Design a protein around this ligand. Structure first.
Ligand SMILES: COC(=O)NC1=C2/C(=C\CSSSC)[C@](O)(C#C/C=C\C#C[C@@H]2O[C@@H]2O[C@H](C)[C@@H](NO)[C@H](O)[C@H]2O)CC1=O
Ligand SMILES: Cc1cn([C@H]2C[C@H](O)[C@@H](COP(=O)(O)OP(=O)(O)O)O2)c(=O)[nH]c1=O
Ligand SMILES: [Cl-]
Length: 379
């Protein structure tokens, strides 16, 4: 009954955080839990868990650069359109997974997991499960449909699969990220699960901060877009914000915001803060379209505007749904203006719809319940 469970994540905070509730779900159910990730191992440790860094010195941004340089045709074609069918993006996602393989396979041999839980980007997790000979459970991201994505990714890792004597298995269960209404007409892949936001711990101070008298709007762009494309995209958003009669809080995480210089007087900045803690006191949020941020805004019950850098192809899958369900607005960073921010804060139908989608979401099975379901499925 007592298991060793290995959680496997691609080297991204947006990849890793959606595994944390399940990892604490397994730990509080008495199991041993270990995380495999690269680049962000210290953040995983700051969730109170044990971590092995399966690729020391990894840099996602350097991997991205190497892909573009090495695949100029892909870069000038497929990469000029949104990443929707990830089968087409196998070359890029395989480049991301490749450096994690050797370290993950060694870890599987040493740790001997009974179960692998991996996030949807981490084909290396399926390979790990096959190495150990154990079931794999997939945790989905945003609204991407899996289809043949793992076969396409694996087609570029063939050499490594041969060396480690592994084939690509199918997961025994898949767990959706979004609530049913935000998948539109796309067929669900497995179980729905409530989104319980995780963004790190925090000392809030000597008291619980009160909700401000004036409405505050958060501006956040996740953990990879501005790192990969530069901080420039947030400038037109901040300029538009300075023209709006509302207060704004800029939350770009560990990103150095020095290049922005002096912010408008109605815009304040914070360093890394768990997003749900920030949003507890906000009226709306402007962001890039990251799935974790979309879901955390829904947990807060607030309208959202998705305005990524126009070059970023990985923020597309929530956009149609945010639109069609009326819980927010969609644009691009360079097209944000004061009128659009006023719509975000003023259109009551957006807030009504957000609250309705939140009600749907918070009734879904919890991570604790989902741990029980997984254990039943594999027993
Ligand atoms: C801006 O630059 C990018 O976005 N980069 C990339 C991301 C990748 C794959 C995603 S699709 S597989 S999950 C079916 C990538 O494989 C690799 C990597 C390492 C870090 C990263 C991020 C990228 O996605 C991020 O994933 C989050 C889970 C999403 N929220 O749910 C975010 O919306 C999205 O921003 C390749 C990549 O280039
Ligand atoms: C920048 C920032 C992000 N976050 C969280 C919100 C999300 O859970 C996660 C970002 O994931 P996500 O929004 O999926 O996008 P990306 O992969 O593009 O970064 O990081 C914080 O909690 N605090 C912060 O200061
Ligand atoms: Cl959070």
């Amino acid at each position: 009954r007592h298991m060793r469970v290995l959680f496997v994540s691609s080297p991204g905070i947006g990849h890793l955080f959606p595994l944390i509730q399940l990892a604490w779900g397994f730990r509080t159910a008495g199991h041993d839990v270990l995380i495999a990730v690269a680049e962000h191992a210290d953040r995983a440790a700051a969730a109170g868990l044990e971590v092995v860094d399966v690729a020391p010195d990894y840099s996602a941004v350097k991997v991205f650069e190497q892909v573009a340089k090495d695949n100029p045709r892909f870069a000038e074609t497929v990469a000029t359109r949104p990443a929707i069918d990830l089968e087409e993006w196998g070359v890029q996602i395989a480049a991301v997974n490749r450096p994690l393989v050797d370290g993950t396979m060694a870890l599987v041999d040493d740790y001997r997991p009974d179960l692998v839980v991996y996030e949807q980007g981490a084909t290396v997790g399926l390979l790990a499960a096959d190495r150990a000979g154990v079931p794999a459970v997939q945790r989905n991201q945003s609204a991407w449909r899996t289809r043949g994505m793992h076969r396409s990714i694996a087609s570029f890792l063939t050499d490594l699969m041969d060396k480690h004597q592994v084939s690509l298995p199918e997961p025994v269960a898949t767990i959706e990220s979004f609530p049913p209404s935000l998948l539109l007409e796309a067929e669900p892949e497995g179980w729905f699960m409530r989104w319980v936001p995780y963004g790190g711990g925090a000392v809030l101070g000597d008291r619980l901060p009160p909700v401000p008298a004036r409405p505050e709007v958060a501006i956040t762009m996740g953990t990879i877009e501005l790192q990969a494309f530069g901080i420039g995209a947030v400038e037109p958003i901040i300029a538009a914000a300075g023209e709006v009669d509302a207060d704004f809080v800029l939350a770009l995480g560990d990103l150095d915001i020095s290049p922005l210089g002096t912010l408008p007087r109605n815009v304040r900045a914070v360093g890394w803060t768990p997003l749900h803690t920030l949003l507890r006191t906000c009226t709306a949020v402007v962001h890039h379209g990251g799935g974790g941020t979309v879901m955390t805004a829904i947990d807060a019950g607030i309208p959202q505007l998705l305005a990524p850098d126009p070059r970023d192809q990985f923020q597309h899958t929530a956009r149609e749904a945010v639109s069609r369900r009326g819980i927010g607005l969609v644009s691009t960073s360079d097209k944000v203006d004061a009128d659009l921010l006023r719509r975000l804060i003023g259109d009551e139908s957006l807030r009504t719809a957000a609250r309705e989608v939140r009600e749907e979401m918070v009734a879904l099975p919890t991570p604790a319940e989902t741990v029980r379901r997984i254990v039943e499925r594999i027993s």
